[PDB]
Short mmCIF file of C-alpha atoms in Angstrom, two decimals:
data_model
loop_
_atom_site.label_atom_id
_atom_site.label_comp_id
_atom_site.label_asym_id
_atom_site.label_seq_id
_atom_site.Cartn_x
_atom_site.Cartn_y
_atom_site.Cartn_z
CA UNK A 1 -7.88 -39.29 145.89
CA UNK A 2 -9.86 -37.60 148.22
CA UNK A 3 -11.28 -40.23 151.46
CA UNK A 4 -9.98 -41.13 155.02
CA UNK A 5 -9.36 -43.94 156.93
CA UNK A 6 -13.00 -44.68 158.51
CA UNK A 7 -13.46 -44.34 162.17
CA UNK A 8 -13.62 -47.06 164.54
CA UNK A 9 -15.14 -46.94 168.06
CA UNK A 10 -12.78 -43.85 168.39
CA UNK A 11 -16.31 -42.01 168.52
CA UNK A 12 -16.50 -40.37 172.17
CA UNK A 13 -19.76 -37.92 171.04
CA UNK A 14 -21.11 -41.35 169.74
CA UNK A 15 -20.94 -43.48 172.60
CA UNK A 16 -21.30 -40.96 175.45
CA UNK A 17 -25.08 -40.36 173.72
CA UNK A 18 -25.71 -44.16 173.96
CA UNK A 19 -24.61 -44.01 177.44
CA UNK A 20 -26.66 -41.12 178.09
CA UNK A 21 -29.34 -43.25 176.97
CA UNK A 22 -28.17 -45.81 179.21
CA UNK A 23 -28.25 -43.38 182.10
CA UNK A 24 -31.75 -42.39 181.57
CA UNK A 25 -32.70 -45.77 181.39
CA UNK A 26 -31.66 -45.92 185.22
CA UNK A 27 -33.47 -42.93 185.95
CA UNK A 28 -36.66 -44.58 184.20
CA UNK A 29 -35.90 -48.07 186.49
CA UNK A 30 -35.77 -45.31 189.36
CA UNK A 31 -38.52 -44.04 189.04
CA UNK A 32 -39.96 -47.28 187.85
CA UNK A 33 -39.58 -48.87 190.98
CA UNK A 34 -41.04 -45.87 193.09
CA UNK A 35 -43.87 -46.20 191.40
CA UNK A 36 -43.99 -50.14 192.10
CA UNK A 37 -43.69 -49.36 195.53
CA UNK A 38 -46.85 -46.91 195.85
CA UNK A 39 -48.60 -49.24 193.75
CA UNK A 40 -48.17 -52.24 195.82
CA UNK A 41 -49.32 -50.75 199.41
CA UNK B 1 28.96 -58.56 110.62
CA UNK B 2 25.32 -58.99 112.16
CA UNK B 3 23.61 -58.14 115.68
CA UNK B 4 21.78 -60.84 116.64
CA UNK B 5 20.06 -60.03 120.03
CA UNK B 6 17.41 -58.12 121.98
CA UNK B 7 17.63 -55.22 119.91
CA UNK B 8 14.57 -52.28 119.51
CA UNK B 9 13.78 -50.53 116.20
CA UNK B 10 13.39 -47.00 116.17
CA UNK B 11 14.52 -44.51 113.49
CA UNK B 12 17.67 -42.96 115.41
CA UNK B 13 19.23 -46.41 115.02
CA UNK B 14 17.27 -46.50 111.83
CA UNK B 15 19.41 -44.10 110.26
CA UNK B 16 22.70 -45.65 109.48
CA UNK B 17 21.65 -49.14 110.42
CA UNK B 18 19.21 -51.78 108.49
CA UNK B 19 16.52 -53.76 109.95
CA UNK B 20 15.31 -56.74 109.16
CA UNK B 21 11.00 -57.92 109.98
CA UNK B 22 10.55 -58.25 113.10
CA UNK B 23 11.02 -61.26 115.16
CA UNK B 24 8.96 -60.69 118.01
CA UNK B 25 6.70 -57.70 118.82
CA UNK B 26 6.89 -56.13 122.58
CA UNK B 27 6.41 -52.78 124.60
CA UNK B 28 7.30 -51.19 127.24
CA UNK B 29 6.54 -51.91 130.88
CA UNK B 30 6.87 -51.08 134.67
CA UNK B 31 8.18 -53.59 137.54
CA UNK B 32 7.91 -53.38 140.98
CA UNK B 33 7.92 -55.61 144.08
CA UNK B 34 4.79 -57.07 145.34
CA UNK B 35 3.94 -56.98 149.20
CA UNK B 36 1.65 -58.95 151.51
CA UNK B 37 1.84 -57.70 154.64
CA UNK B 38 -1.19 -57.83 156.88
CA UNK B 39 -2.30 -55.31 159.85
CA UNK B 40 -2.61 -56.95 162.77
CA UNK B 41 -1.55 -54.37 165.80
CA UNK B 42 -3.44 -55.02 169.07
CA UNK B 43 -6.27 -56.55 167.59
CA UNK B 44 -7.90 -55.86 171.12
CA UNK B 45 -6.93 -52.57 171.91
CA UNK B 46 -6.93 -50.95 168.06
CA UNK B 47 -10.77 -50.18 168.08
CA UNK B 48 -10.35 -49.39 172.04
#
C-alpha cells in the first residue's frame, strides 16, 4: 500500500516560480513602458 | 432426543453424533459497521 495523500496548493517552490514569473512580467511592463516613452517623443 | 437448530457439520461433532442431509448450505463471513462520514474542514482555508 505504498501512495500519499496528494498535495494541494501546499506547494510554496510551485507558486513562488509562478510568481517569479509574475514579477518578471512587471519588469517586462517596466521596461515596456520606457521604451513607449522614447518611442513617442 | 433430536437437535433441531442452527447447527454446523464438521467431523469433531461428527464423531459421536449423526447427521442428517443438509438443510441449508452456508459459510463463513465477516461483519463490520459501515461509515459515511464526509470531509468537510475549512473548505476555504484547507487548500490555503
Amino acid at each position: 500500500e505504498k501512495n500519499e495523500v496528494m498535495s494541494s496548493q501546499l506547494d510554496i517552490d510551485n507558486m513562488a516560480g509562478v510568481f517569479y514569473m509574475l514579477g518578471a512580467a512587471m519588469a517586462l511592463s517596466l521596461i515596456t513602458f520606457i521604451c513607449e516613452h522614447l518611442f513617442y517623443w | 432426543d433430536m437437535i433441531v437448530a442452527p447447527l454446523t457439520i464438521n467431523n469433531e461433532r461428527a464423531q459421536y453424533i449423526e447427521f442428517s442431509k443438509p438443510f441449508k448450505y452456508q459459510g463463513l463471513t465477516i461483519l463490520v459497521k459501515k461509515e459515511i462520514p464526509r470531509s468537510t474542514l475549512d473548505s476555504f482555508m484547507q487548500p490555503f
